[PDB]
Amino acid sequence: SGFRKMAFPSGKVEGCMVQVTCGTTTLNGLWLDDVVYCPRHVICTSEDMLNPNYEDLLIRKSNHNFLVQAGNVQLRVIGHSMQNCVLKLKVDTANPKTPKYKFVRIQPGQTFSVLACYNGSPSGVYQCAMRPNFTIKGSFLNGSCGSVGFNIDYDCVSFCYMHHMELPTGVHAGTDLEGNFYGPFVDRQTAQAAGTDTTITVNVLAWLYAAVINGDRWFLNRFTTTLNDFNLVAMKYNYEPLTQDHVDILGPLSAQTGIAVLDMCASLKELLQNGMNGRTILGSALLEDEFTPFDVVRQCSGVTF
Amino acid sequence: SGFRKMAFPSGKVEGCMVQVTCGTTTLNGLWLDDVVYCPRHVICTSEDMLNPNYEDLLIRKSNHNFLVQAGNVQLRVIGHSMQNCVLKLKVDTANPKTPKYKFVRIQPGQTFSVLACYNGSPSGVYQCAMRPNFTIKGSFLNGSCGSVGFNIDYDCVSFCYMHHMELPTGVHAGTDLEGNFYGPFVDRQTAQAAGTDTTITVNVLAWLYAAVINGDRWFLNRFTTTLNDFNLVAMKYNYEPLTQDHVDILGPLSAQTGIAVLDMCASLKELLQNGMNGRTILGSALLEDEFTPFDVVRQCSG
Ligand SMILES: O=C1C[C@]2(CCOc3ccc(Cl)cc32)C(=O)N1c1cncc2ccccc12
Ligand SMILES: O=C1C[C@]2(CCOc3ccc(Cl)cc32)C(=O)N1c1cncc2ccccc12
Ligand SMILES: [Cl-]
User: Which candidate, A55, B180, B227, B290, has a CA 20 to 30 Å from the CA of A6?
Assistant: First the structure.
């Protein structure tokens, strides 16, 4: 029993974090095999960041301009190239702690663990989800650039996020490990804002199933609904539309608890129109949307890595 | 910006988790140097958990009865002893991944990271606090016994908890790394219940200071209070009494925000009275009590 926002063990990722310094800028890098991946804004100065030309800035730089540090050992840069918004620094030494890995691009609603680092040294680990507006509600300070997001499936680490910047509202923006941003953002100091966010409907449903599995049933009712009627209700409360794919994905949870997905949708509809009335679900007064159906099954079963 | 329930990087602890098997029981162990520490209930069978005699059960065991596994390698047990409710198995090999460590006993209200393991293999990591009733609101299933709680302050790992059992209410009970339980609990299957829990007042105050540091002030008011008047109001909402030590501890946060601890206490008094009225503090509709003053300074300042 118990339900917590659980992160994947960070150990395999800790052995990859390095500190990257170019000029006056210092951020984090990911050292996999003989390459260090880091945000390309490590080459930017104060004047440069206003309107940067990264090809023009990079072409001036030589290998010795980049100081890469792995603990107390200095790694010597022997080459460099740019891939979208990420800088790939070829180093003379392959990381002996390189795990089995893949670079994956995740979709909004999907979750991942974040290893927050400062000066190539990891400080903490937390769990979070890619919001529908493509931002992440993370916990980051200046110097956290280059911190990575990941999932660990069996023994393989799937890198899905590299932190780049914070938006004026306190939320965070970054790219996949191939340099492509999540969201309509750019790596430049400019007026940018996160779009209006929405609630991840499929995840709230998964979390309602997790509450039922842990002995919380007060919110259940005898009623059911159609997917069409539920979506008209959810649209009014700024919830993401629920698709047939979401219904199929919630299948195993529906069978484990004996509550149909449309039956659970009718419970969610009552919570939206009437609230909790002084009650909580899994120790929360708000409807939690940062646990996917897969996270619920992995936590209420005990899967190891 | 941003405020999350953040755990310490688990890597140093992952390199210590082993699987311990005695008879039919299988749980987790902590391998530090040439010793494996695990809950002593690994020697108990079916008609043993009600009224076990651990000295009589252990005296019947030899070294070769304990199978210790570190990944795919089997560790050889060369000795054994019991320390309170923990079993210490001497092994022939010192752990090459043994970090710099200390065994610390924490007090109620204090927080720590938990590395949840099954069959000596870590599955997840989360943050949690020792509740005033000495239990932890954790996430554990059968096979999680021997999972450990820790803090990593600087480069040293401070082991403070080892998981032993789940109480009928869904909460968890365990010991420090010297086998002394936290709470009036026993490693028996007898009828045991967690005492009535209370809210960690000092932690809610620390979390209110964290909200002010992140730009939120709606809950502040023009009033102040005395410590005694605040405690009379707090006791009605099942809050732990706030002591002079708690006031001193909140000192740096009071100076950083410019808000006196007794003025922040008046905000909490009002919050308890009014609720939130459709508003949230740091993305929460409830008053969070699982972040200490130290956790707030760590996450907001460095
Ligand atoms: O360290 C940096 C570099 C910076 C600074 C602003 O100008 C830019 C412009 C573009 C880019 Cl890609 C990055 C940055 C940025 O957002 N961060 C941070 C990143 N995450 C959280 C943060 C919190 C507080 C201050 C900074 C933070
Ligand atoms: O694996 C064990 C052994 C056990 C089983 C019950 O009898 C006892 C009696 C004493 C002791 Cl020290 C441990 C146990 C126990 O609580 N757990 C668990 C531990 N954490 C969570 C759990 C959830 C669901 C089932 C079991 C759980
Ligand atoms: Cl303590």
Answer: B180
Kindly tell me the burial class for residue B15, based on how many C-beta atoms sit within 10 Å of its own C-beta (0-12, 13-18, 19 or more): middle
B243 Cβ neighbours under 8 A, 6+ residues apart: none
What's the CA gap between B261 and B250, in Å, rounded?
7
How are beta strands A111-118 and B101-103 bridged, if at all? unpaired
- When CB atoms are compared, the residue of A14, A138, A285 closest to B11 is A14
Counting ligands in written order, the one closest to the CA of B146 is 2
Query: Residue B223 and residue B207: Cα distance in Å, rounded?
Result: 19
User: Which residue ranges does chain B devote to CATH 1.10.1840.10?
Assistant: 198-301
> Contact at 8 Å (CB) between B144 and B128?
no
Catalytic residue check, A163:
no
Contact assessment for residue B224 and residue B262, using Cβ atoms and an 8 Å cutoff: yes
Closest C-alpha to A36, from A66, A65, A73 = A66
* Nearest atom within ligand 1 for CA of residue A189: 9
* Residue from B84, B103, B105, B139 nearest B16 by CA: B103
Q: Which CATH fold would you assign to the domain B1-14+100-197? A: Thrombin, subunit H (2.40.10)
Is there a contact between B9 and A138 if contact means CB atoms under 8 Å apart?
no
Kindly identify the ligand whose nearest atom is closest to the C-alpha of B165: 2
DSSP annotation of B151: E
Cβ within 8 Å of residue A177, ≥6 positions away: A30, A37, A86, A103, A148, A159, A160, A161, A162
- Per CB-CB distance under 8 Å, the chain B contacts of A291 are none
CATH 2.40.10.10, chain A: domain bounds: 1-14+100-197, 15-99
Interface check for A168 against chain B (CB to CB < 8 A): the answer is no
| Residue B33 to residue A7: CA distance in whole angstroms | 27
Q: Which CATH architecture has domain B198-301?
A: Orthogonal Bundle (1.10)
DSSP structural state of residue B112: E
Q: How many CB pairs under 8 A join A and B?
A: 126
Rounded to the nearest 5 percent, the helix, strand and coil shares of chain B are 25, 30, 45
Resolution as reported, in Å: 1.9
Q: Rounded CA gap, B99 and B8, in Å?
A: 14
Residue of B nearest to A153 (CA): B123
**Span from the CA of B152 to the centroid of ligand 2 (angstroms):** 27
Characterize the bridge pairing of strands B111-118 and B101-103.
Answer: unpaired
Domain B15-99 sits in CATH at 2.40.10.10
Q: Give the closest-approach CA distance of B118 to chain A in angstroms.
A: 7
Structure tokens at A175: 């790219």
Phi and psi torsions of B251, nearest 5°: -45, -60
B139 at A interface, C-beta within 8 A: yes
Burial class (CB within 10 angstroms; exposed 0-12, middle 13-18, buried 19+) of A126:
buried
C-alpha triplet A186, A192, A194: angle, nearest 5°: 100
Distance of alpha carbon A262 from alpha carbon A275, whole angstroms: 19
Solving technique for this entry? X-ray
Residue A66 to residue B222: CA distance in whole angstroms = 53
Distant-in-sequence, close-in-space partners of A257: CB < 8 Å, separation ≥ 6: A209, A212, A213
